Amino acid sequence: LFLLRHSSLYDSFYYSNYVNAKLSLWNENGKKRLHKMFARMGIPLSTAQETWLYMDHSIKRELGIIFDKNLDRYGLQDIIRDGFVRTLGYRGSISASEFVEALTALLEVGNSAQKLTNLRKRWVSNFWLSWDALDDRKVELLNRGIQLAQDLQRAIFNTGVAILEKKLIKHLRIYRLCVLQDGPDLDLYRNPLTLLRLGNWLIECCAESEDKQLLPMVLASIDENTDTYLVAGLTPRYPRGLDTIHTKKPILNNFSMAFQQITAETDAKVRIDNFESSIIEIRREDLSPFLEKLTLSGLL
């Protein structure tokens, strides 16, 4: 669940990739199913939306049993897991996943060639906010990171809702394709990490499920201040928590090789300077020929 200990239980179930994937919370049916689940668990809606600290202690203590008996009905049996929780005297307790989420949020939104250099300088600066958050004396930074993580997850959820409602995810035999052109929050997706977050959200939702053959996904975004794309190849994922011989085997990311070969053969002034070779920057005009060549290559 997303930041269970620093938000409400309703928010924790709502803004979770796995819960949305297994319930489709991006439409009204998913919300109705979630409300029905909460009603059968015996937790009032007002109680669920209460913050974690002030939630009724009886329900908080019984939460483990309540989940043990009710999550199986709705297919959320995988929510049960064992993690590491760290506490300091007279302070709140924070789990490892929540700490990592706060650090990533600080890294992402913490606060021609010239603009690119300025953006990369800003990211380098955010690195130091993330570094400072690792200290026990700087807890205000951690709280700020938690709030930014909540906001970023909300924005990514809105963008994913927009993508899925419009049916923007074109399906080609070799691979899937999704291109963002006129979203409300296009600026947030200049950072590769936010784009990867959105890509993971989309991969878990409606793709990990539906019993559809695994297919690599292409996610692209556009920034008007520079008029270029940020293409990011994403490897497919097996259903979460499904131990199997084929699930035991890993899935490799072949997009770096195909992108490099296309760039070398073609002439579109593509950038492969990023460490993650699957993320490239493409000029506005060249994306259509690049995708044509990608489809015709068949090396994905």
Asked whether position 51 contacts other proteins by CB under 8 A, the answer is: yes
Stretch that binds other proteins, among 22-30, 47-55, 153-161, 289-297 (CB under 8 A): 47-55
Q: Which two tokens stand for residue 36?
A: 């029905």
CA distance 188 to 110: 12
Q: Which residues 198-237 are close enough to bind other proteins by CB under 8 A?
A: none
CA distance 55 to 49: 9
Asked whether position 114 contacts other proteins by CB under 8 A, the answer is: no
Tell me the closest approach of the beta carbon of residue 299 to other proteins, in angstroms.
39
Asked whether position 62 contacts other proteins by CB under 8 A, the answer is: no
CA distance 203 to 207: 5
CA distance 269 to 265: 11
Are 188 and 194 contacting, i.e. CB atoms less than 8 angstroms apart? yes
Using CB under 8 A, pick the residue from 50, 62, 223, 286 that binds other proteins: 50
- Give first-to-last CA distance, the chain, whole Å: 33
Asked whether position 117 contacts other proteins by CB under 8 A, the answer is: no
Asked whether position 125 contacts other proteins by CB under 8 A, the answer is: yes
Rank residues 144 and 176 by Cβ distance to other proteins and give the closer one: 144
Rank residues 146 and 258 by Cβ distance to other proteins and give the closer one: 146
CA distance 118 to 122: 6
* Binding positions for other proteins, rule: CB under 8 A: 49-51, 53-54, 57, 90-92, 121, 124-125, 127-128, 132, 137, 140, 184
